[PDB]
Each structure stands twice: as structure tokens, then as C-alpha cells.
Design an enzyme around this catalytic site. Structure first.
Site, short mmCIF file in Angstrom:
data_model
loop_
_atom_site.label_atom_id
_atom_site.label_comp_id
_atom_site.label_asym_id
_atom_site.label_seq_id
_atom_site.Cartn_x
_atom_site.Cartn_y
_atom_site.Cartn_z
N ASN A 46 2.34 -7.42 5.82
CA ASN A 46 1.77 -6.12 5.50
C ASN A 46 1.14 -6.05 4.11
O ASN A 46 0.50 -5.04 3.80
CB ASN A 46 2.85 -5.03 5.59
CG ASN A 46 3.14 -4.62 7.02
OD1 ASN A 46 2.27 -4.72 7.89
ND2 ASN A 46 4.36 -4.16 7.27
N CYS A 48 5.14 11.14 2.01
CA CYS A 48 4.28 11.48 0.88
C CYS A 48 3.83 12.93 0.95
O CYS A 48 3.63 13.56 -0.09
CB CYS A 48 3.08 10.54 0.82
SG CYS A 48 1.96 10.64 2.23
N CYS A 59 -3.76 3.95 9.93
CA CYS A 59 -4.66 4.82 10.67
C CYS A 59 -4.25 4.93 12.14
O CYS A 59 -5.10 4.83 13.03
CB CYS A 59 -6.10 4.30 10.57
SG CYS A 59 -6.70 4.11 8.87
N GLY A 65 2.50 -6.30 -2.98
CA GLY A 65 1.47 -7.30 -3.21
C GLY A 65 0.30 -6.75 -4.02
O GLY A 65 -0.17 -7.40 -4.96
N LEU A 66 -0.17 -5.55 -3.67
CA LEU A 66 -1.29 -4.95 -4.40
C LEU A 66 -0.91 -4.66 -5.85
O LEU A 66 -1.68 -4.94 -6.77
CB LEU A 66 -1.74 -3.68 -3.69
CG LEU A 66 -2.82 -2.81 -4.34
CD1 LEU A 66 -4.08 -3.61 -4.58
CD2 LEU A 66 -3.11 -1.59 -3.48
N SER A 125 3.19 1.26 -0.60
CA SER A 125 3.15 0.04 -1.40
C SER A 125 3.60 -1.19 -0.62
O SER A 125 3.10 -2.29 -0.88
CB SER A 125 4.02 0.22 -2.65
OG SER A 125 5.36 0.51 -2.29
#
Ligand SMILES: CCc1c(C#N)c(N[C@@H](C(N)=O)c2ccccc2)nc(N2CCC(N)CC2)c1C#N
Ligand SMILES: [Zn+2]
Ligand SMILES: [Zn+2]
Length: 842
Positions: free
Chosen positions: A820, A433, A468, A392-393, A388
DNA sequence: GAGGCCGCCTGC
DNA sequence: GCAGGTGGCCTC
């Protein structure tokens, strides 16, 4: 050998339909699936469904084939299940001779318990196959690379014997593409008036607002001649020895090439010309519209837009006639006084909304009042946000009103703390995760901190951006890189999606995500999503087109569960520099685009650096005061929106990094004119703040490629300026005001354009990075007028963060948190599309 | 800790 | 050739 089975059912003109046929030893009834061999013997078998059978007057026996699409023909390519087919809107009539054989094609419908069927390992997700006969589950759109649930178009009581889904849908598309007229209003001597018209599924009535291209009409005020910038004036080539490296006239971040936004009209008349017999020519639809002035369209030029609301207009009595085919979309334009709500609530209540309070007289150049005739919820999805950051998202999704982010996973502790600060009542996990997912699968209910783990059914939406690292190259895979990928956070995120099976899934990433490893990361992600049974698509979006003064292209992968509707990508809201709006993606030499149709213009003017930060008080290099005064009200619409409704006595995080004395002098010597960077530095001795001296840059070698200055001075600074000569260490100069490395290697780095570059008030930010460095890769971080790098607050403004959004840690931590993050305006546009799908569910 | 220095690939 | 897209790692 080949003949009909039975009697006729419909003899239409030159053809005779029959329900079942016999070929050799087999029989074919409508609804079966057949194969056809292509003219090239080595190409795989074409597969189709027979929808009609008949005999022709002069050709012979015929049938109608609705083609399937091979999985490898889609964007999945070789990654597809080798026996998976996809429904497409491709069909044709074909001679019954071409049929090779009858094949068994079955529809693998997701079960009613689909949401609980997840839990397969990454190996199965990436490479597992169904291991059965020919099967299909999804309909495929080849131009947008969209996998969706099969359409449910029903047959007719008269056209069920020859019914083709592809034919029906293509007829629907053509008919909706046709612009038509509707209920007639009046019959005049010259034209026939109408009350309503249809175009692309949009209904336009009299009095509605219409978007028009900027070329549709002009205003009565004259576009007064702007003084075009003259050619590059001769400069003192000894005082500014690097200015010659600015021979290109292209300015990074400039908005001089940004297109004009839409003209806004109000439909006064819809009409068609009358044929000589009195009947209207309904194939030539015209509309007469009243002109609306943007503030910048008045006698007051561009400056009038600095303070005005982005959706504020002025009524005019000027009129224009345009073709109906030129309408780019429908919009609402209202007089603000007679509104059932305040103007802000109206503007936030829906898309394509504009308001006017006064009128404009071009001849008078004054603002009178408009004439009399000018007048006239769902529950949020429980969301898990993996990787997260500071949020922002999630903030953008919340602004869209679609999500409550109940769980977040952020391994970086300062960003996790910022997310906690901005989202009380949300459970933030700092663990890996993979560890969390393993605990959930093992059956744990709480992590080692006591936080309750999300379970199946809790996660209604899943969003995130996975890094990635290790496979972010364009070169093809190998064993090592492929292993790193299948052990990566992208695959972990896909496993989260497979396990929880939420209604909606969002993967955001850098633009080049669509091309990594010869587009193989993208292909494998889509393959996993299809393997789960998800509807899915991908695209590239430009953040600047959704309300930020920043160029930021991001790759977006969307997925929707079966029974849901697949979201569209948001149409651009703001015009933006076309060079920064190249969104097409090439995969295996096939060019894919998104559903976006706004390519030339848009409803709103571009957001600039002025809109972004013109209201922030001046601060010095190394400013550290965490809480200061705004010293004034917000000036622009953007600043008003980001400051919010409740009065904020304190401005926070308007702090800048403390650059060294040499860097500070360099910044102080960068000119304020747009496009200025290190190449405009003067070659002088200057005493620094710490008492030390910054020395002249001495040109010690001859550059045959770059030549010599007007005074005959050389232009090389090292022996490497020669063909094969290596860098002599004695040629390295230190503490020069003009940094030595920039002319040292400028010939092979586009003269390091943009380093120590100032922002332009009328322009936009380059991609907001985690740590602004004037001599880094993205070195255009200098303030337009102040001798400093952009502040944390200024970076947040460039990202579209509200001023109240809380950050955590030191200044570098806050810079990284801002860099980010997904821009909340972009996240909100995506969320609004998701909300459209939520409201349109069957 | 911070600053200097700077290859490789792609799309046009 | 020009513009864009990617930080990282030596060294103090
Ligand atoms: C343009 C500025 C730059 C960057 C940058 N942003 C860079 N990033 C790469 C690196 N740091 O490995 C890289 C890091 C992570 C992922 C992918 C790539 N590398 C440069 N190179 C090559 C390696 C270096 N040893 C010499 C110069 C330059 C330049 N000039
Ligand atoms: Zn058809
Ligand atoms: Zn050299």
C-alpha cells in the site's frame, strides 16, 4: 464612426501608435478589456485585453489583443466557474473593427488573510461559483495543465505604451531556447574558442560535465557481439502441453528494451567555425569533450555495474566533437581524492553528481591513474499525512529533507502501529478523518484519546492518498455514483486542504485516477483546488524511473498556496522500459503531459532485481524466522543504500508465505529461465510433501481455435471450448499440477501470462501488490531461483524501503503495508522538487 | 482461515 | 488480437 482620440505618440515605419480611440459611443484606452466574436456565431465570445493601439499604412486601425482563456477551455472543462478566466501566453494583432464591446474583467487577488478563509462545505468547493462579473485569478499553461500565480513581468521605460505580457514572455522563452556563446577565449586558424555557452537557461563552462544522448559518441572498446537468443526451440509437446501458449516472444519485466543512459562528457573546448572573413559562425556551436566510461562501458561488460556505485565513472583520454544542441543537461564530474567531503556525502549532496577515481585505457584494457590535468538549512514543514499507511510517502519526504510529519491519519491499526514505530514524536490518529475534521471545526482541541488536534497554521504541508472505492470505474457519472464521490475520502482530503490551507498539497493515487468517470474525478479535484485559490497541476509518474526495480505508475496532484511557487514534476533519474513509461493523460480528447523532458535516456542505469535482492540469503517456502543473518556485506549500490551506514547485524522480515503442497510443487516445477510461468509446467504425476498426489491434466475436448499438439492430442479441457456449449461440471479436474482453470479460460485472458511466473535477475518487479499470489491477477511473484514467492523483505526492497524501516503485525499485514505504500524514492524526488520551490520563494 | 476461479474496459 | 489494470467471492 471610429477614429483616434488625440495626437500620435510613435510613428514607426508603416504604423502610427495612439493612446486612446473612440468607437461609436464608447472610448477605449490601453488596459481595458474587450470582446471579439469568433467566425462561428455559436461559439462564445473571445475575451482579451488591449495592450496597444495604432494605425497601419495599408490595412487600417489595429490593436493588440492579449487573449484570456475561458475556464471551460482549460482542463476543468464544464466544471469550471462559468465566468472565470485564466491568463495565457496567447496574443495577436487584430483590426479594431473586430472589437464587439468593452467588458469588465477584474482580478480576484487572494487576501493577506487567505490562509484563514477556508471552511466552505464540499458543495461549495465542488459547484460553488463566484457570482460576479468576469474575473481571473490564475495563469494557465495548456500543455502541462498548470494553474499558477500571474506573472509579475514589469514594463520598460521605452516600451510601456505598447507593452504586452504575453509578447514579453514569449520573447523570453525564445531567447532562452536559443543556444548562445559567451566570453571568448582564443582565436585559432580554424575555429574560435569560448569559455562559456548558454542553453535552456543553463550555463556551460570549460570543464563542466555534459549529458549527451547515447548516440552522441562511441567508445574505443568494441561492443562485442552478444549471442542473440535463438528462436523458440522445439519442445516435447506431450511433456509440456501448455508451452504452445507462449507463442508471443514478449517477456514481462524484461529490460532488453530499456534505453542506454546518458553519455557523460567533460567540456574540453567550446568553439564555433570561422567564416571566411574570420568572424565566427555563432549559429553553429560545437563542443569537444573528454569521454567518461561507465563501468559497464569498459572491456568488462554489464557485470562491472553490479557492485559499482551508480554514479561512478572512469576518466578517459578519448575525445569526441558533438554539436552543442545535443547537450541534454549539465552535470558535475569530480575526482574523488581532492574532494572536501567523503564520496558518499558528495553523492547525497545534490543532483547530477558523478565521481571518478581511476582512468581507463581501452587499448590497454587496464585501470591506471588519471592524469594531472584531470584534476581542478531551511526549517522543515510541519506535515499532516492522511491515509499514511506505514509511512512510505512520509519517509520519502523526510529523506528529501522538507518535512516533519507531525500528524498522521491511518484507520488500519497495523499500519498505524508501524508508522508509530518508525515516527516517534508524531501523533497518529486511527479515527475517521471526517470525524477528526468535524471535531476540529466544532472547536475541540483533543480527540477521545487525548491527542492534540492540529489547528489552522499548524499544518504547513498536507499529503495523502485517498482510496476511491465505489467510483473507480471509467463509465460516466450518475446520481448515485456522484453522491458517493461527494461523500468520499477524496472530497474529505480536499476539505482538509481547504480548512488548513497548507503551503503545499500532494494527492497520490493509482494511475487511472486521472481517467476515473471520464476524467471527472480529476477534473473535480482540480476544480476544488482552483476554487480554494490554489495553484495546482497533475501528472503521472513511473516509480521505476526514480530508483526502484518495479513498474508502478501513479497519479500525482500538486498544489501550492498563493505566494508560493508551483513545484515541477521530477525529471526521471534512471532509464526504464519504455512500455512502462507512457505518462501522457487524455482528458476530453486533449492530451496533457508533464514538464518532464527526459523521454529517451537518463543519467543512471536501471535498477534490477539483482540490485534489489541479490544479497539476501536463501530461505525456504514458508520461511518464518523474523531475525536472520545477512551472511555477507551488501553487494550492489542499491543494497548499500538500503542497508545504510551503521552496520546491521540482523536481517528482519525475510519471511515468505507458507504455500500449500500443491502450490509448492508447482513453484518447484517452474523453470528458472527468464519468462517462465505456468505454461512451462510439465504434465506429470508428482507426490506432494503431505503424501498426496498431483495428477496429470487430461485434455478432454477439441479446441478448433488452438488445434492439436504434435502428437495429435487435444487441447481443450472443458465443453466450453466449443462455440455455444456450456461448462460441463464433469469436465472439471482437481489437484492437477497444471491448474485446470488456466487452460479452462486462457483463450480470453492472454493465456494467463505471468501466473506462477519467476522474476528475472536483469529485470524488474511488476507492481508490488498487498498479497503475492501466484495464481492471482499479478501472479509473477516467484523468486528467480528459489521455489517460493517473494519475501516481505524482498517486496520492501522492490518498494525502495530501507532495511531498518519497521513493519508491524503478521506476514500478511506486513505484505499489505509494503504493497500500500508509496515508494520512498518517488516520494523523495517529489519532495526535492518541493524543496526547490521552498528555497526559491520570493 | 486459504485456495479456486475468473469479467470488463481501455490503449495500441 | 495483445497487453495492462483493477480483487473479490464463493466454497471448503
Ligand atoms: C484479472 C483478475 C480479475 C480481477 C482482478 N484483479 C477482478 N476484479 C474485479 C472484481 N473482483 O470484481 C474488481 C474488483 C475491484 C474493483 C474493480 C474490479 N475481476 C475479475 N473478474 C470479474 C469479476 C469476477 N466475478 C469474475 C472475473 C478478474 C478475472 N479474471
Ligand atoms: Zn502580445
Ligand atoms: Zn468450461
Amino acid at each position: 464612426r471610429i477614429s483616434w482620440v488625440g495626437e500620435a505618440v510613435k510613428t514607426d515605419g508603416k504604423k502610427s501608435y495612439y493612446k486612446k480611440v473612440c468607437i461609436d459611443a464608447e472610448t477605449l484606452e490601453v488596459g481595458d478589456c474587450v470582446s471579439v466574436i469568433p467566425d462561428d456565431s455559436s461559439k462564445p465570445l473571445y475575451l482579451a485585453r488591449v495592450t496597444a493601439l495604432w494605425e497601419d499604412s495599408s490595412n487600417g486601425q489595429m490593436f493588440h489583443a492579449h487573449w484570456f482563456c475561458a475556464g471551460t477551455d482549460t482542463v476543468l472543462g464544464a466544471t469550471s466557474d462559468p465566468l472565470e478566466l485564466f491568463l495565457v501566453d496567447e496574443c495577436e494583432d487584430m483590426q479594431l473593427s473586430y472589437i464587439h464591446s468593452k467588458v469588465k474583467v477584474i482580478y480576484k487577488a487572494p487576501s493577506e488573510n487567505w490562509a484563514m478563509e477556508g471552511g466552505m462545505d464540499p458543495e461549495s468547493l465542488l459547484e460553488g461559483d463566484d457570482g460576479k462579473t468576469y474575473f481571473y485569478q490564475l495563469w494557465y499553461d495548456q500543455d502541462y495543465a498548470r494553474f499558477e500565480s500571474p506573472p509579475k513581468t514589469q514594463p520598460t521605460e521605452d516600451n510601456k505604451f505598447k507593452f504586452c505580457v504575453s509578447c514579453a514572455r514569449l520573447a523570453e522563452m525564445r531567447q532562452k531556447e536559443i543556444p548562445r556563446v559567451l566570453e571568448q577565449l582564443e582565436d585559432l586558424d580554424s575555429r574560435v574558442l569560448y569559455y562559456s555557452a548558454t542553453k535552456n537557461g543553463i550555463l556551460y563552462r570549460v570543464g563542466d560535465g555534459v549529458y549527451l544522448p547515447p548516440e552522441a559518441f562511441t567508445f574505443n572498446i568494441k561492443l562485442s557481439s552478444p549471442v542473440k537468443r535463438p528462436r523458440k526451440e522445439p519442445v516435447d509437446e506431450d511433456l509440456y502441453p501448455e508451452h504452445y501458449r507462449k507463442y508471443s516472444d514478449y517477456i514481462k519485466g524484461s529490460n532488453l528494451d530499456a534505453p542506454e543512459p546518458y553519455r557523460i562528457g567533460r567540456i574540453k573546448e567550446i568553439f564555433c567555425p570561422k567564416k571566411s572573413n574570420g568572424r565566427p559562425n555563432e549559429t553553429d556551436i560545437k563542443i569537444r569533450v573528454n569521454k567518461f566510461y561507465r563501468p559497464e562501458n569498459t572491456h568488462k561488460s554489464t557485470p562491472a555495474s553490479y557492485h559499482a556505485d551508480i554514479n561512478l565513472l572512469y576518466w578517459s583520454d578519448e575525445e569526441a566533437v558533438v554539436d552543442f544542441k545535443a547537450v541534454q543537461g549539465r552535470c558535475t564530474v569530480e575526482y574523488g581524492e581532492d574532494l572536501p567531503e567523503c564520496v558518499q556525502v558528495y553523492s547525497m549532496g545534490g543532483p547530477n553528481r558523478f565521481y571518478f577515481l581511476e582512468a581507463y585505457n581501452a587499448k590497454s584494457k587496464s585501470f591506471e591513474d588519471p592524469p594531472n590535468h584531470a584534476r581542478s538549512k531551511l526549517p522543515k514543514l510541519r506535515t499532516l499525512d492522511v491515509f499514511s499507511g506505514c509511512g512510505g510517502l512520509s519517509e520519502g519526504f523526510h529523506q528529501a529533507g522538507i518535512s516533519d510529519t507531525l500528524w498522521a491519519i491511518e484507520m488500519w491499526d497495523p499500519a498505524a502501529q508501524a508508522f508509530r514505530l518508525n515516527n516517534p514524536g508524531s501523533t497518529v490518529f486511527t479515527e475517521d478523518c471526517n470525524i477528526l475534521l468535524k471535531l476540529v471545526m466544532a472547536g475541540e482541541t483533543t480527540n477521545s484519546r487525548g491527542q492534540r488536534l492540529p489547528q489552522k497554521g499548524d499544518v504547513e504541508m498536507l499529503c495523502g492518498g485517498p482510496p476511491c472505492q465505489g467510483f473507480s470505474g471509467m463509465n460516466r457519472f450518475n446520481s448515485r455514483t456522484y453522491s458517493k464521490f461527494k461523500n468520499s475520502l477524496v472530497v474529505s482530503f480536499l476539505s482538509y486542504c481547504d480548512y488548513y490551507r497548507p503551503r503545499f498539497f500532494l494527492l497520490e493515487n493509482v494511475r487511472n485516477f486521472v481517467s476515473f468517470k471520464r476524467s471527472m474525478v480529476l477534473k473535480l479535484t482540480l476544480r476544488c483546488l482552483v476554487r480554494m485559490g490554489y495553484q495546482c497541476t497533475f501528472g503521472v509518474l513511473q516509480a521505476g524511473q526514480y530508483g526502484v526495480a518495479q513498474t508502478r505508475r501513479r497519479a500525482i496532484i500538486l498544489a501550492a498556496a498563493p505566494g508560493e511557487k508551483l513545484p515541477l514534476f521530477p525529471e526521471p533519474l534512471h532509464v526504464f522500459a519504455p512500455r512502462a513509461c507512457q505518462l501522457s493523460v487524455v482528458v476530453d480528447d486533449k492530451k496533457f503531459v508533464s514538464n518532464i523532458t527526459r523521454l529517451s535516456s537518463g543519467p543512471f542505469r536501471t535498477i534490477t532485481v539483482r540490485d534489489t535482492m541479490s544479497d539476501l540469503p536463501e530461505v525456504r517456502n514458508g520461511a518464518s524466522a523474523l531475525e536472520i543473518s545477512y551472511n555477507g556485506e551488501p553487494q550492489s549500490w542499491f543494497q548499500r543504500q538500503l542497508r545504510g551506514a551503521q552496520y546491521q547485524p540482523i536481517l528482519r522480515d525475510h519471511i515468505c508465505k507458507d504455500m500449500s503442497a500443491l502450490v509448492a510443487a508447482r513453484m518447484r516445477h517452474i523453470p528458472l529461465a527468464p519468462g517462465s510461468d505456468w505454461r512451462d509446467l510439465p504434465n506429470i504425476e508428482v507426490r506432494l510433501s503431505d503424501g498426496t498426489m498431483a495428477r496429470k491434466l487430461r485434455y478432454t475436448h477439441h479446441d478448433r481455435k488452438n488445434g492439436r499438439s504434435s502428437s495429435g492430442a487435444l487441447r481443450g479441457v472443458c465443453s466450453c471450448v466449443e462455440a455455444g456449449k456450456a461448462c460441463d461440471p464433469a469436465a472439471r479436474q482437481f489437484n492437477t499440477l497444471i491448474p485446470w482453470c488456466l487452460p479452462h479460460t486462457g483463450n480470453r485472458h492472454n493465456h494467463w501470462a505471468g501466473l506462477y511466473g519467476r522474476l528475472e535477475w536483469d529485470g524488474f518487479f511488476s507492481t508490488t501488490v498487498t498479497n503475492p499470489e501466484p495464481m492471482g491477477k499479478q501472479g509473477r511473484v516467484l523468486h528467480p531461483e528459489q521455489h517460493r514467492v517473494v519475501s516481505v523483505r524482498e517486496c520492501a526492497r522492490s518498494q525502495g524501503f530501507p532495511d531498518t524501516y519497521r513493519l508491524f503485525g503478521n506476514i500478511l499485514d506486513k505484505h499489505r503495508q509494503v504493497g500500500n505504500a508509496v515508494p520512498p524514492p518517488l516520494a523523495k524526488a517529489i519532495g526535492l522538487e518541493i524543496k526547490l520551490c521552498m528555497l526559491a520563494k520570493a
